């Protein structure tokens, strides 16, 4: 065979972005030249150790693992170049390029292996995929779960943003396997974020447990399936309300535009907390940076009730003041009235400048928006005062099923607020 070979249709993958270039093999070694980056990679003949050939995305692909524990990768080859590569390596490098396609059975389970700056998810003997750990911009852990957040290249149209691995428990290792996986990842990656992360918060609209990551200009509502991102520019008002039984707290966020989910749009983000649910949070910032950003409204480390913490954070973030119940106190001593609406029971709170009905299809009506009100009396003479509210826009909201004493108190309240009682 000849002492030199060349290839012009070779590619190179770099952080998910494909890059073309030329390749040349010779007794001196293997020299590749990228076109977009203009870099020149060289592998001496005395460094190669293992050569794998596998059908990659762009045609086929060669994988060269050298004595230095580093693995180079090339793409853009044809199925016939394998014979040439193997013959050249066997005649000059004493190596035989062997084929080793990836697992094509399509299974989301297998084993994980670490080697240099590259992670490999395999199944038995055939690999499933590989992940260069050097490209990880962050590594987080959870309950039997590890998550890797990567950087992002402009040329990569479909960039792999985030990956997650469910790590089962293994008491034989002594240390938590999740912590072990995280340490193995950090030992090879170069991690460089969210201000604070609340994990699992009882949400009513939407329903379910959702973690909340805070950012300087938005908040990431992460769920077990669906995720949302609400910029602070979309927030309108923050409402902190107590529960009728005086045991829970409602934290309502008025959104605009409303977050969309298929064929439904949510105009309010409702959260439910317990007064006996404390927390101790530590920001991902320094003291001086926090002083400059929040102007001292927050501190590097805080502790207190969970709802209080959320209220303080959201206030310091949005600058809008958190609305609180007014001077209303029902006959039952509660700060609301239990009433029905749109075939659903719920709580109506007379705020300082409007009404807010929660939580099932919530509603909010400011005093200025109300055209008039009507204390319709239902069938009975006891616990049958429908507090209908017609707005200046023409929408009439019917809040039916209200106790007699609640109606008497609301009557005095509305007479104090001075509203058009029809």
């Amino acid at each position: 065979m000849a002492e030199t070979l060349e290839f012009n249709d070779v590619y190179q993958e770099v952080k998910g972005s494909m890059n073309d270039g030329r390749l040349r093999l010779s007794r001196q070694g293997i020299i590749f030249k990228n076109s977009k980056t203009g870099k020149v990679d060289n592998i001496q003949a005395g460094e190669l150790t293992e050569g794998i050939w596998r059908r990659v995305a762009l045609g086929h692909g060669l994988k060269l693992l050298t004595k230095n524990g580093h693995v180079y990768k090339y793409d853009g080859f044809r199925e016939s170049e394998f014979e040439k590569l193997s013959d050249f390596f066997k005649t000059h490098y004493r190596l035989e390029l062997m084929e080793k396609d990836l697992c094509v059975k399509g299974w989301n389970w297998g084993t994980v292996k670490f080697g240099g700056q590259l992670l490999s998810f395999d199944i038995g003997d055939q690999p499933v995929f590989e992940i260069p750990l050097s490209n990880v911009s962050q590594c987080t852990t959870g309950k039997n779960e590890v998550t890797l957040e990567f950087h992002q290249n402009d040329d990569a149209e479909v960039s792999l943003m985030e990956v997650r691995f469910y790590v089962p428990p293994t008491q034989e290792d002594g240390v938590d396997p999740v912590e072990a996986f995280a340490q193995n990842v950090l030992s090879k990656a170069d991690v460089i974020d969210a201000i604070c992360i609340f994990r699992e918060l009882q949400c009513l609209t939407p329903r379910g447990r959702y973690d909340i990551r805070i950012y300087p200009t938005f908040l990431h509502l992460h769920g077990k399936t669906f995720d949302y991102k609400i910029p602070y520019t979309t927030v309108l008002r923050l409402f902190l309300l107590p529960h009728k039984d005086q045991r829970q707290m409602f934290f309502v966020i008025s959104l605009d535009p409303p977050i969309k989910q298929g064929q439904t749009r949510y105009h309010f983000l409702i959260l439910l907390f317990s007064k006996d649910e404390d927390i101790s949070l530590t920001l991902n910032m320094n003291e001086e940076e926090v002083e400059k950003r929040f102007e001292g409204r927050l501190t590097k480390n805080m502790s207190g009730s969970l709802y209080e913490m959320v209220s303080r954070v959201m206030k310091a973030l949005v600058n809008r003041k958190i609305t609180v119940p007014g001077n209303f106190q029902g006959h039952s001593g509660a700060q609301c009235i239990t009433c029905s609406y749109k075939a659903s029971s719920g709580l109506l709170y007379p705020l300082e400048r409007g009404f807010i009905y929660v939580h099932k299809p919530p509603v909010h009506i400011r005093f200025d928006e109300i055209s008039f009100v009507n204390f319709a009396r239902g069938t009975t003479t006891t616990r049958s005062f429908d507090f209908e509210i017609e707005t200046k826009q023409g929408t009439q909201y019917t809040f039916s099923s209200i106790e007699r004493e609640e109606y008497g108190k609301l009557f005095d309240f509305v007479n104090a607020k001075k509203l058009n009682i029809k």
Binding site: V104, W107, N108, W109, T170
Partner: protein
């Protein structure tokens, strides 16, 4: 008295690499979906990794003005909630890929053809359709197994 017991086996996208597709989307590293074989091939750093539609538990998509996020969640111990609990994995002690998120810019490149997020949207729709068809066929087969022919 005697009893009865049946068998079962997990799903396979392609029994051998020779059965792998060869499409320009895969060449360009676009989330491809083979319907005849019911498989989803996704890019993993120059590696077109396939996954059978059965592995995926659900998928979600979000638009953030500048970028669009496409999340894909598979099945794994702890996440096998609902009527899938009986689907005990063959090795619950192995590592399960529970979530994979891809990001595509919504900005249309200068006078180019399609937008990257359009590819993610199309992929989402096709995956939902394939999952619907797969679940429909599985439900049909499961309810036919055990009927007394009349």
């Amino acid at each position: 008295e005697q009893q009865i017991q049946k068998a079962r086996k997990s799903n396979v996208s392609y029994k051998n690499p020779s059965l792998m597709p060869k499409e320009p989307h895969i060449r360009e590293m676009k989330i491809y979906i083979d319907k005849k074989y019911e498989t989803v091939i996704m890019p993993v750093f120059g590696i077109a990794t396939p996954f059978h539609i059965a592995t995926i538990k659900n998928i979600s998509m979000s638009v953030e003005g500048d970028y669009t996020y496409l999340r894909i969640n598979f099945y794994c111990p702890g996440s096998a909630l609902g009527r899938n609990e009986g689907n005990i994995f063959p090795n619950p002690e192995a590592t399960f890929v529970k979530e994979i998120t891809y990001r595509a810019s919504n900005i249309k490149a200068p006078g180019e053809q399609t937008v990257p997020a359009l590819n993610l949207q199309n992929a989402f729709r096709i995956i939902k359709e394939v999952q619907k068809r797969y679940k429909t066929r599985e439900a049909e087969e499961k309810e036919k197994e055990g009927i007394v022919k009349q």
